[PDB]
From a paper:
To confirm the identity of the extra, Cμ2-proximal electron density as the N terminus of FCHO2 linker, chimeras of Cμ2 alone with N1+N2 attached to the C terminus via 30-residue unstructured synthetic glycine-, serine-, and alanine-rich flexible linkers were then created, crystallized, and their structures solved at resolutions varying from 2.0 to 2.6 Å by MR using an unliganded version of Cμ2 as a search model. The Y pocket is variously filled by parts of the tags of an adjacent Cμ2 molecule. Muniscin family conserved side chains make key interactions with Cμ2 residues 167 to 170, which form the BR3 PtdIns(4,5)P2-binding site. The N1 interaction occurs mainly via complementary charged interactions between Asp318, Glu320, and Glu321 and the Cμ2 BR3 PtdIns(4,5)P2-binding site containing Lys167, Tyr168, and Arg169. Isothermal titration calorimetry (ITC) measurements showed the binding of FCHO2-N1+N2 to have a KD of ~25 μM. Mutation of key binding residues in Cμ2 (E320A+E321A+K326A) reduced binding fivefold, and mutating Tyr323 to serine rendered it unmeasurably weak. The FCHO linker does not directly interact with the Y or Ø cargo motif binding pockets in any structure but does pass close by before its main chain changes direction at FCHO2 Pro327.
Proper operation of the pivotal CME cargo adaptor AP2 requires membrane-localized Fer/Cip4 homology domain-only proteins (FCHO). The AP2 complex, composed of α, β2, μ2, and σ2 subunits, is pivotal to mammalian CCV formation, and its deletion is embryonically lethal in mice. FCHO1 and FCHO2 are similar in overall domain arrangement —folded N-terminal acidic phospholipid-binding homodimerization F-BAR domains and C-terminal folded μ-homology domains (μHD) separated by a ~300-residue, low-complexity intrinsically disordered protein linker, which has been suggested to participate in AP2 activation, although how it does so is undetermined.
Residue numbers in the entry: 153 to 225, 239 to 435, 477 to 488, 492 to 501
Write the structure that this text describes.
Amino acid sequence: PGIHMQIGWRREGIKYRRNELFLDVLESVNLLMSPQGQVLSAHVSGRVVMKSYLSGMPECKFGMNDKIVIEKQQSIAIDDCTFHQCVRLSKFDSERSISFIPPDGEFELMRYRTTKDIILPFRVIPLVREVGRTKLEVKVVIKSNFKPSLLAQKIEVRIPTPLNTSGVQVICMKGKAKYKASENAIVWKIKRMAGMKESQISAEIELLPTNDKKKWARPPISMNFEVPFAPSGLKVRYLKVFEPKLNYSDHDVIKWVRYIGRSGIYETRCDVDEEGYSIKPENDTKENHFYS
């Protein structure tokens, strides 16, 4: 008369020398924008990734800024949500609670979709004034829209060029830029850029008009960037833990949180053991922490 629960995704007797967990919030923000700035199309697809280095059978509870925020007065509006099997869905439907017993090591806790209240990290404003059939004048400004303390990185703006181009001279003060004729685009790279900033690029584009009477469609300005926050607005409120056999809780745990927002289609038009103890697995930016 005693039933033995056996979780298919977590063995028993897991031991870590130090109880700790990792949370990676990985979002791709996509956009189609008009030259004037009208949002024609936008969505974020995100996923919370978790690396559990916890001992025993910990009973966790993931807390974010959902529509429980609407009860206590920034948030994330989740259109669609899919969970790992470990997540009790019963509780999520009754109380919006993401409770679970995590697998050992890395697992994807949830993926999601978002279309409203997206923090669009960048706006591109393009001008193209034709000045004769000889020349084209191109002015492209990029506005960063996030906290000034924060830095976007690995930025690349691909401004398309028309096929009938004999050559182009370009100038920018921030970053570096090359006209890659093979590509049919001037490619503009900036290493870092803080929030609430401007930056301009000007390109005098000389034309060779052989064809006449036909102006064909051209690709839009596409941007790549990496941003240290969730463009959906996702903020991790807590990761509560309770393991009643070993009597330890989140107060006895180190939680490591990271946000990696990355551009998607952002377009604008013109474990092992040893002695019982499990071992953490291991190209990434190095930071000296006391407990690392």
